[PDB]
Coordinates of C-alpha atoms and ligand atoms in Angstrom, one line a residue:
Chain A
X1 CA 153.5 111.9 133.1
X2 CA 154.4 114.1 136.1
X3 CA 151.0 113.1 137.6
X4 CA 151.8 109.3 137.4
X5 CA 152.7 108.9 140.9
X6 CA 149.5 110.5 142.2
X7 CA 146.7 108.8 143.5
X8 CA 143.5 109.4 141.2
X9 CA 141.5 110.6 143.8
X10 CA 144.0 112.7 145.2
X11 CA 144.2 114.4 141.9
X12 CA 140.5 114.9 142.0
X13 CA 140.6 116.5 145.3
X14 CA 143.7 118.8 144.1
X15 CA 141.8 119.8 141.0
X16 CA 138.9 121.1 143.1
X17 CA 141.1 122.9 145.5
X18 CA 142.7 124.5 142.3
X19 CA 139.3 125.7 141.0
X20 CA 138.7 127.1 144.4
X21 CA 142.3 129.0 144.3
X22 CA 141.6 130.2 140.5
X23 CA 144.7 128.2 139.3
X24 CA 143.2 126.8 136.2
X25 CA 146.6 125.7 134.6
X26 CA 147.2 123.4 137.9
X27 CA 143.3 122.3 137.7
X28 CA 143.8 121.3 134.2
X29 CA 147.1 119.3 134.9
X30 CA 145.7 117.5 137.7
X31 CA 142.6 116.6 135.7
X32 CA 144.8 115.2 132.7
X33 CA 146.8 113.2 135.3
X34 CA 143.3 111.8 136.4
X35 CA 141.9 111.0 132.9
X36 CA 145.4 109.3 132.0
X37 CA 144.6 106.7 135.0
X38 CA 142.6 105.0 132.4
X39 CA 139.3 105.0 134.1
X40 CA 136.1 106.5 132.9
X41 CA 135.2 109.8 134.4
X42 CA 131.9 110.5 136.5
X43 CA 129.6 113.4 135.6
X44 CA 131.4 115.6 138.2
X45 CA 134.6 114.7 137.0
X46 CA 133.8 115.3 133.2
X47 CA 132.8 118.8 134.4
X48 CA 136.2 119.3 136.4
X49 CA 137.8 118.5 133.1
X50 CA 135.9 120.7 131.0
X51 CA 136.1 123.8 133.7
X52 CA 140.2 123.4 133.9
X53 CA 140.5 123.4 130.1
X54 CA 137.8 126.1 129.3
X55 CA 139.4 128.5 131.7
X56 CA 143.1 127.6 130.2
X57 CA 141.9 128.1 126.6
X58 CA 139.7 130.8 127.0
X59 CA 142.9 132.9 128.5
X60 CA 145.0 131.8 125.6
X61 CA 142.0 132.9 123.0
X62 CA 141.6 136.6 124.8
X63 CA 145.4 136.9 124.6
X64 CA 145.4 135.7 121.0
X65 CA 142.8 138.0 120.2
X66 CA 144.7 141.2 121.7
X67 CA 147.8 140.3 119.8
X68 CA 146.1 139.4 116.6
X69 CA 144.3 143.0 116.7
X70 CA 147.9 144.5 117.5
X71 CA 149.1 142.8 114.6
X72 CA 146.4 143.7 112.0
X73 CA 146.7 147.6 112.9
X74 CA 150.5 147.2 112.4
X75 CA 149.5 146.1 109.0
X76 CA 147.7 148.9 107.8
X77 CA 148.6 151.7 105.4
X78 CA 150.6 154.5 107.2
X79 CA 151.6 152.1 110.1
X80 CA 155.2 152.5 111.4
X81 CA 157.4 149.5 110.8
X82 CA 158.1 147.8 114.2
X83 CA 159.9 144.7 113.3
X84 CA 158.8 140.9 113.7
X85 CA 158.1 141.0 117.3
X86 CA 154.5 141.4 116.9
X87 CA 153.9 138.3 114.9
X88 CA 156.6 136.4 116.9
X89 CA 154.6 137.0 120.0
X90 CA 151.0 136.5 118.5
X91 CA 152.8 133.2 117.2
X92 CA 153.9 131.7 120.6
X93 CA 150.8 132.6 122.2
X94 CA 149.2 130.8 119.2
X95 CA 151.5 127.8 119.4
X96 CA 150.8 127.4 123.1
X97 CA 147.0 127.7 122.5
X98 CA 147.2 125.1 119.8
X99 CA 149.3 122.7 122.3
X100 CA 146.2 122.9 124.8
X101 CA 143.8 122.1 122.2
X102 CA 146.1 119.5 120.8
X103 CA 146.3 117.9 124.5
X104 CA 142.5 117.9 125.1
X105 CA 141.6 116.2 121.7
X106 CA 144.5 113.7 122.8
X107 CA 142.8 112.9 126.0
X108 CA 139.3 112.5 124.1
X109 CA 140.8 110.3 121.3
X110 CA 142.8 108.2 123.9
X111 CA 140.5 107.1 125.2
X112 CA 137.7 109.0 126.8
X113 CA 135.3 109.1 123.5
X114 CA 135.9 105.4 122.7
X115 CA 134.7 104.1 126.1
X116 CA 131.8 106.5 126.5
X117 CA 128.7 104.7 125.8
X118 CA 125.8 106.6 127.8
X119 CA 124.5 109.7 126.0
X120 CA 125.3 112.0 128.9
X121 CA 128.9 111.2 128.8
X122 CA 129.4 110.5 124.9
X123 CA 127.7 113.7 123.9
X124 CA 129.6 115.7 126.4
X125 CA 132.8 114.5 125.0
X126 CA 131.9 114.9 121.2
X127 CA 130.9 118.5 122.3
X128 CA 134.5 119.3 123.8
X129 CA 136.1 117.7 120.6
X130 CA 133.9 120.1 118.4
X131 CA 134.9 122.8 120.8
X132 CA 138.6 122.2 120.6
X133 CA 138.7 122.0 116.8
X134 CA 136.6 125.2 116.9
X135 CA 139.5 127.0 118.6
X136 CA 141.9 125.3 116.3
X137 CA 139.8 126.7 113.4
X138 CA 139.7 130.3 114.9
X139 CA 143.6 130.4 114.6
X140 CA 144.1 128.3 111.5
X141 CA 144.9 129.9 108.3
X142 CA 147.1 127.1 106.5
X143 CA 146.1 124.2 104.0
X144 CA 144.6 122.3 106.7
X145 CA 142.0 125.0 107.9
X146 CA 139.1 123.3 105.9
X147 CA 139.9 120.1 107.4
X148 CA 140.0 121.7 110.9
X149 CA 136.6 123.4 110.4
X150 CA 135.4 119.8 109.2
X151 CA 136.4 117.8 112.0
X152 CA 134.6 120.5 114.4
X153 CA 131.6 120.3 112.4
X154 CA 131.5 116.4 112.4
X155 CA 132.2 116.0 116.2
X156 CA 129.2 118.4 116.5
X157 CA 127.0 116.8 114.3
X158 CA 127.5 113.4 115.8
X159 CA 126.9 114.9 119.1
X160 CA 123.8 116.6 118.0
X161 CA 122.3 113.2 116.4
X162 CA 122.9 111.4 119.6
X163 CA 121.3 114.3 122.0
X164 CA 118.5 114.4 119.7
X165 CA 117.8 110.5 119.9
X166 CA 118.6 109.9 123.5
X167 CA 118.1 113.3 125.5
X168 CA 115.1 115.4 126.1
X169 CA 115.1 119.0 124.4
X170 CA 115.9 120.6 127.8
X171 CA 119.1 118.3 128.9
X172 CA 121.6 121.0 129.8
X173 CA 124.1 119.0 127.8
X174 CA 122.0 119.1 124.6
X175 CA 121.1 122.7 125.1
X176 CA 125.0 123.7 125.4
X177 CA 126.1 121.6 122.7
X178 CA 123.2 123.6 120.4
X179 CA 124.3 126.9 121.6
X180 CA 128.0 126.1 120.6
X181 CA 127.5 124.5 117.5
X182 CA 125.2 127.5 116.6
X183 CA 128.3 129.7 117.3
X184 CA 130.1 127.4 115.2
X185 CA 127.9 128.2 112.4
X186 CA 128.0 131.8 112.8
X187 CA 131.7 132.5 113.8
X188 CA 133.5 129.6 111.8
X189 CA 131.4 128.2 109.1
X190 CA 130.2 131.4 107.7
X191 CA 126.5 130.1 108.0
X192 CA 124.8 132.9 110.1
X193 CA 121.2 131.4 108.9
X194 CA 122.1 128.1 110.1
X195 CA 123.3 129.5 113.5
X196 CA 120.1 131.6 114.0
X197 CA 117.6 128.7 112.9
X198 CA 119.6 126.1 115.3
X199 CA 119.4 128.7 118.1
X200 CA 115.7 129.4 117.6
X201 CA 114.7 126.0 117.1
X202 CA 116.6 124.7 120.2
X203 CA 115.0 127.5 122.3
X204 CA 111.3 126.9 121.2
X205 CA 111.7 123.1 121.6
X206 CA 113.1 123.5 125.0
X207 CA 110.4 126.0 126.1
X208 CA 107.7 123.4 125.3
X209 CA 109.5 120.8 127.4
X210 CA 110.0 122.9 130.6
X211 CA 106.6 121.9 131.9
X212 CA 108.1 118.4 132.7
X213 CA 110.9 119.6 135.0
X214 CA 111.5 120.2 138.5
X215 CA 112.4 123.7 140.0
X216 CA 116.1 122.8 139.8
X217 CA 116.0 121.1 136.5
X218 CA 114.0 124.4 135.5
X219 CA 116.5 126.5 136.7
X220 CA 119.4 124.8 134.8
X221 CA 117.7 124.5 131.5
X222 CA 116.4 128.3 131.3
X223 CA 119.9 129.5 132.1
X224 CA 121.2 128.0 128.8
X225 CA 118.3 129.1 127.0
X226 CA 118.9 132.7 127.7
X227 CA 122.2 132.2 126.4
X228 CA 120.5 131.2 123.3
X229 CA 118.1 134.1 123.2
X230 CA 121.3 136.5 124.1
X231 CA 123.0 135.1 121.2
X232 CA 119.7 135.6 118.9
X233 CA 119.4 139.2 120.2
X234 CA 123.2 139.6 119.0
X235 CA 122.4 138.2 115.8
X236 CA 119.1 139.8 114.8
Chain B
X1 CA 131.6 137.7 121.4
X2 CA 128.8 135.2 121.4
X3 CA 128.1 133.0 124.4
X4 CA 129.4 129.4 124.6
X5 CA 129.4 127.0 127.6
Chain C
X1 CA 168.5 131.6 129.9
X2 CA 165.8 131.1 127.2
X3 CA 165.8 134.9 126.5
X4 CA 169.4 135.0 125.8
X5 CA 169.1 135.1 122.1
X6 CA 166.5 137.9 122.0
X7 CA 167.5 141.6 121.7
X8 CA 167.1 143.6 124.8
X9 CA 164.8 146.3 122.8
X10 CA 162.5 143.1 121.6
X11 CA 162.1 141.8 125.1
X12 CA 161.1 145.2 126.3
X13 CA 158.5 145.4 123.4
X14 CA 157.2 142.1 124.0
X15 CA 156.9 142.8 127.7
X16 CA 154.7 145.6 126.7
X17 CA 152.6 143.3 124.3
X18 CA 152.5 140.9 127.3
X19 CA 151.0 143.5 129.5
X20 CA 148.4 144.6 126.9
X21 CA 147.4 140.7 126.5
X22 CA 147.3 140.4 130.4
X23 CA 150.0 137.5 130.2
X24 CA 151.9 138.6 133.3
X25 CA 154.1 135.5 133.6
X26 CA 155.3 136.1 129.8
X27 CA 156.0 139.8 130.7
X28 CA 158.2 138.7 133.7
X29 CA 160.1 136.3 131.6
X30 CA 160.5 138.9 128.9
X31 CA 161.7 141.6 131.5
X32 CA 164.1 138.9 133.4
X33 CA 165.6 138.5 130.1
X34 CA 166.1 142.2 129.5
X35 CA 167.7 142.7 133.1
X36 CA 169.9 140.0 132.5
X37 CA 171.4 141.8 129.5
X38 CA 173.5 143.6 132.2
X39 CA 172.5 147.3 131.2
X40 CA 170.8 149.4 133.9
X41 CA 166.9 149.9 133.4
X42 CA 165.2 153.2 132.6
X43 CA 162.4 154.5 134.5
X44 CA 159.9 152.9 132.2
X45 CA 161.5 149.4 132.4
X46 CA 161.8 149.4 135.9
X47 CA 157.9 150.0 136.0
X48 CA 157.6 147.3 133.8
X49 CA 159.7 144.6 135.6
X50 CA 157.8 145.8 138.7
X51 CA 154.3 145.5 137.2
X52 CA 155.3 142.0 135.6
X53 CA 156.2 140.6 139.1
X54 CA 153.7 142.1 141.2
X55 CA 150.9 140.6 139.1
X56 CA 152.6 137.2 139.2
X57 CA 153.2 137.2 142.8
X58 CA 149.7 138.7 143.7
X59 CA 148.1 135.9 142.0
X60 CA 150.1 133.4 143.8
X61 CA 149.7 134.9 147.2
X62 CA 145.9 135.2 146.6
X63 CA 146.1 131.2 145.7
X64 CA 148.1 130.7 148.8
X65 CA 145.8 132.3 151.1
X66 CA 142.8 130.7 149.7
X67 CA 144.7 127.3 150.1
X68 CA 146.0 128.1 153.5
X69 CA 142.4 129.2 154.8
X70 CA 141.0 125.7 153.7
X71 CA 144.0 124.3 155.4
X72 CA 143.3 126.0 158.6
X73 CA 139.8 124.9 158.6
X74 CA 140.7 121.1 158.1
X75 CA 142.8 121.4 161.2
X76 CA 139.7 122.9 163.6
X77 CA 137.8 120.4 166.1
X78 CA 135.4 118.3 164.4
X79 CA 136.7 118.5 161.1
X80 CA 136.9 115.3 159.0
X81 CA 140.2 114.0 158.1
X82 CA 141.1 114.3 154.2
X83 CA 144.4 113.3 153.8
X84 CA 147.7 115.3 153.0
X85 CA 146.2 116.8 149.8
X86 CA 145.7 120.2 151.2
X87 CA 148.8 120.5 153.0
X88 CA 150.5 119.3 149.8
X89 CA 148.9 121.6 147.2
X90 CA 149.4 124.7 149.6
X91 CA 153.2 123.5 149.9
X92 CA 153.1 123.3 145.8
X93 CA 152.0 127.0 145.6
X94 CA 153.9 128.3 148.3
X95 CA 157.0 126.6 146.7
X96 CA 156.3 128.3 143.5
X97 CA 155.7 131.5 145.3
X98 CA 159.0 131.5 147.1
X99 CA 160.6 130.7 143.8
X100 CA 159.3 133.8 141.9
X101 CA 160.4 135.9 145.0
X102 CA 163.9 134.3 145.0
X103 CA 164.2 135.3 141.2
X104 CA 163.4 138.9 141.9
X105 CA 165.5 139.3 144.7
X106 CA 168.2 137.7 142.6
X107 CA 167.8 139.9 139.8
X108 CA 168.2 143.1 142.4
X109 CA 171.4 141.7 143.9
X110 CA 172.9 140.7 140.4
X111 CA 173.1 143.3 139.8
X112 CA 170.4 146.2 139.7
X113 CA 170.9 147.5 143.2
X114 CA 174.6 147.9 143.3
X115 CA 174.6 150.0 139.9
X116 CA 171.6 152.1 141.0
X117 CA 173.1 155.4 142.0
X118 CA 170.2 157.8 141.5
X119 CA 167.6 158.1 144.3
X120 CA 164.8 157.3 141.8
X121 CA 166.6 154.0 140.7
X122 CA 167.8 153.2 144.2
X123 CA 164.8 153.7 146.3
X124 CA 162.4 151.8 143.8
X125 CA 164.7 148.5 143.7
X126 CA 165.4 148.8 147.7
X127 CA 161.5 149.1 147.9
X128 CA 161.2 146.1 145.7
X129 CA 163.5 144.2 147.7
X130 CA 161.5 145.0 151.0
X131 CA 158.1 143.9 149.1
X132 CA 159.7 140.5 148.0
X133 CA 161.2 139.5 151.6
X134 CA 157.8 140.7 152.7
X135 CA 156.1 138.1 150.5
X136 CA 158.6 135.5 151.7
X137 CA 157.8 136.7 155.3
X138 CA 153.9 136.3 155.0
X139 CA 154.6 132.3 154.2
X140 CA 157.7 132.0 156.4
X141 CA 157.1 129.5 159.5
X142 CA 160.5 128.1 160.0
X143 CA 164.0 129.0 161.8
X144 CA 165.0 131.8 159.3
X145 CA 161.5 133.8 159.6
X146 CA 163.0 136.6 162.1
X147 CA 166.0 136.9 159.6
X148 CA 163.5 136.9 156.6
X149 CA 161.3 139.6 158.4
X150 CA 164.6 141.5 159.3
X151 CA 165.7 141.5 155.6
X152 CA 162.4 143.3 154.4
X153 CA 162.9 145.7 157.5
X154 CA 166.6 146.6 156.6
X155 CA 165.7 146.9 152.7
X156 CA 162.8 149.1 153.5
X157 CA 164.8 151.2 156.0
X158 CA 167.6 152.0 153.4
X159 CA 165.1 153.1 151.0
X160 CA 163.5 155.2 153.5
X161 CA 166.8 156.8 154.5
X162 CA 167.7 157.7 150.9
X163 CA 164.0 158.9 150.2
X164 CA 163.7 161.2 153.1
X165 CA 167.3 162.9 152.0
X166 CA 166.6 162.8 148.2
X167 CA 163.1 163.2 147.2
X168 CA 160.3 165.5 148.2
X169 CA 157.6 164.3 150.3
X170 CA 155.1 164.0 147.4
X171 CA 157.4 161.7 145.3
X172 CA 155.5 158.9 144.1
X173 CA 158.0 156.6 144.8
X174 CA 158.6 157.9 148.2
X175 CA 155.1 157.8 148.8
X176 CA 154.7 154.1 147.6
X177 CA 157.5 153.1 149.7
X178 CA 156.1 154.3 152.9
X179 CA 152.6 152.8 152.0
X180 CA 154.2 149.5 151.7
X181 CA 156.7 149.9 154.7
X182 CA 153.5 150.8 156.8
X183 CA 151.9 147.7 155.6
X184 CA 155.2 145.7 156.6
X185 CA 154.6 147.1 159.9
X186 CA 151.2 146.2 160.4
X187 CA 151.1 143.0 158.9
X188 CA 154.3 141.6 159.2
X189 CA 156.2 143.1 162.1
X190 CA 153.4 143.3 164.6
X191 CA 153.6 147.0 164.9
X192 CA 150.3 148.5 164.2
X193 CA 151.2 151.8 166.0
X194 CA 154.1 152.4 163.9
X195 CA 152.0 151.4 161.0
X196 CA 149.6 154.2 161.8
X197 CA 152.5 156.7 162.7
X198 CA 154.0 156.3 159.4
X199 CA 151.0 156.4 157.3
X200 CA 149.6 159.5 159.0
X201 CA 153.1 161.4 159.0
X202 CA 153.7 160.5 155.2
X203 CA 150.4 161.8 154.2
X204 CA 150.6 165.0 156.2
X205 CA 153.9 165.9 154.6
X206 CA 153.1 165.2 151.4
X207 CA 149.8 167.5 151.7
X208 CA 151.9 170.2 152.8
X209 CA 154.0 170.0 149.6
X210 CA 151.4 169.5 147.1
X211 CA 151.4 173.3 146.2
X212 CA 154.6 172.9 144.7
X213 CA 153.4 170.5 142.2
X214 CA 151.8 170.7 138.5
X215 CA 148.1 169.2 137.9
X216 CA 149.4 166.0 136.6
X217 CA 152.2 165.5 139.6
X218 CA 149.4 166.5 141.9
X219 CA 147.0 163.7 140.5
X220 CA 150.1 161.1 140.9
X221 CA 150.6 162.1 144.2
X222 CA 147.2 162.2 145.6
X223 CA 146.5 159.0 144.3
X224 CA 148.8 157.2 146.7
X225 CA 147.9 159.7 149.6
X226 CA 144.4 158.2 149.1
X227 CA 146.0 154.7 149.7
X228 CA 147.5 155.8 152.9
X229 CA 144.1 157.3 153.8
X230 CA 142.5 154.2 153.0
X231 CA 144.7 152.1 155.3
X232 CA 144.3 154.7 158.0
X233 CA 140.4 154.6 157.9
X234 CA 140.8 150.5 158.0
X235 CA 143.2 150.5 160.9
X236 CA 141.6 153.0 163.1
Chain D
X1 CA 143.8 143.4 152.8
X2 CA 145.6 146.6 153.2
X3 CA 146.6 148.8 150.0
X4 CA 150.2 148.4 148.7
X5 CA 151.9 149.6 145.3
Ligands
LIG1 S1 132.9 123.4 131.2 C1 132.0 122.8 132.6 C2 130.8 122.3 132.1 C3 129.5 122.7 132.9 N1 128.7 123.5 132.5 C4 128.9 124.1 131.1 O1 129.5 124.7 130.8 C5 128.1 123.4 130.1 C6 128.6 122.4 129.3 C7 127.9 121.7 128.3 C8 126.6 122.0 128.2 C9 126.1 122.6 129.1 C10 126.7 123.3 129.9 S2 125.9 124.4 131.1 C11 125.2 123.4 132.3 C12 125.8 122.3 132.3 C13 125.3 121.2 133.2 C14 124.3 121.4 133.9 C15 124.0 122.7 133.9 C16 124.1 123.7 133.3 C17 123.5 124.7 133.1 N2 122.9 126.0 133.2
LIG2 S1 154.8 147.6 139.9 C1 154.6 149.0 138.9 C2 155.3 150.3 139.7 C3 154.5 151.7 139.1 N1 153.2 152.0 140.2 C4 153.5 151.4 141.5 O1 152.7 150.7 141.9 C5 154.3 152.4 142.3 C6 155.5 151.6 142.9 C7 156.3 152.3 143.8 C8 155.8 153.5 144.5 C9 154.6 154.1 144.0 C10 154.1 153.5 143.1 S2 152.5 154.1 142.5 C11 153.1 155.4 141.2 C12 154.2 155.0 141.0 C13 155.0 156.1 139.7 C14 154.2 157.1 139.5 C15 152.8 157.3 139.8 C16 152.1 156.5 140.9 C17 151.3 156.9 141.0 N2 150.2 157.2 141.7
LIG3 MG1 151.0 129.5 113.6
LIG4 MG1 157.0 125.2 152.7

């Protein structure tokens, strides 16, 4: 790996600089190098890894949606034939997106998840695994599409089971996991009722636990609760 | 699109 | 070149798709491939080339400024020593930026400028040459810094001479050239009075020629005149 | 920063 010669601490430092400079591809490459040092990641380091790849894949997903929309319109009745270029370029972006997802899933499988014993790390990584299979599912149309969807579901489900046993209902990782699994149900699994039920129950159980929190924890938890509410408003 | 984190 | 096997028209089509998807690195690579087909570029194709690289280098310049600011603060009195990482990463971004500038300058020199005979193409390319030498000058600190600055000045000056002979004072290319050369004077050449004089005279001569224009040309010209006014307000 | 096009 091209980061093999750089110190772990230097990779982390540069990931933070790349974030400040909004250079998210660099940030992801630095964090990949840090993961490949083989040591477990701290809470802050996990969040750097997550931020970097979320921004990279987020840009790819946005571009893929633009191109997919153009491709769909080109295949409508009365549309003029413009050749293979739209499909080719959509496929190019799609392949790059799949490559990023495969890279993240590879880091999780070699060997972040298997060494993650505390709930805060294990739930975080399993949520990420569900997220990146979900992004693969968004572009999937082949024979393995059902298996891709089930891989996302399985990772989310294991994360949910751990989070319900080991974390309070206001824990921000637990809340963000529920938010994303609910989106999986709505957008991927054709299960809007499950999506709505999960978001509502998560919101209500968090509400009932806010009284235990400091002002700073309350701010963290209510921020994500508002995202759950925003989705409920969109869906109902 | 719906919110995710 | 990796675009050598793709049709010129397909490269142009994909550059437009990349623009819609905000994939400016792809857009630039497609337009580089189109230039390397060896044919002259139309007005629309020149503007695609310009848009693509302006966005790529603009992001690099913004990142370089963030990192340079951090590096400058790290070298202030009382600052804690944090190692070589800030300088290394600033140098990494700087080298990539210089690479993009060298690529654009290489396309202009092989062989866009020498085949550009009409004022609209030749002024456009010479302005770009001044712009990309200006971006090199922004990061230059070595023995060749004066020669880099003079290369920008010389390209801008040739473009100015042609534009004053061959274009009306409201021509948007002429106006944008004057805007950018004025910025060169202010930011690069330590010549704020020349910057102000050029912006003022350009604005006033354009104002006096607006009466000749259609509504659509008037909109194009006044848009750039407002940028000249904005700079004058910033500088006075 | 000043405006350029
Ligand atoms: S991708 C960076 C991860 C940091 N924040 C998140 O996007 C995230 C991820 C999983 C679960 C929840 C959240 S939001 C969050 C996370 C940690 C602490 C506070 C908050 C909030 N609000
Ligand atoms: S980088 C794409 C070039 C298109 N517009 C510009 O940024 C530009 C470049 C050189 C000189 C002027 C301008 S602004 C412009 C250009 C052509 C037509 C109208 C306008 C405007 N307003
Ligand atoms: Mg495909
Ligand atoms: Mg250097």
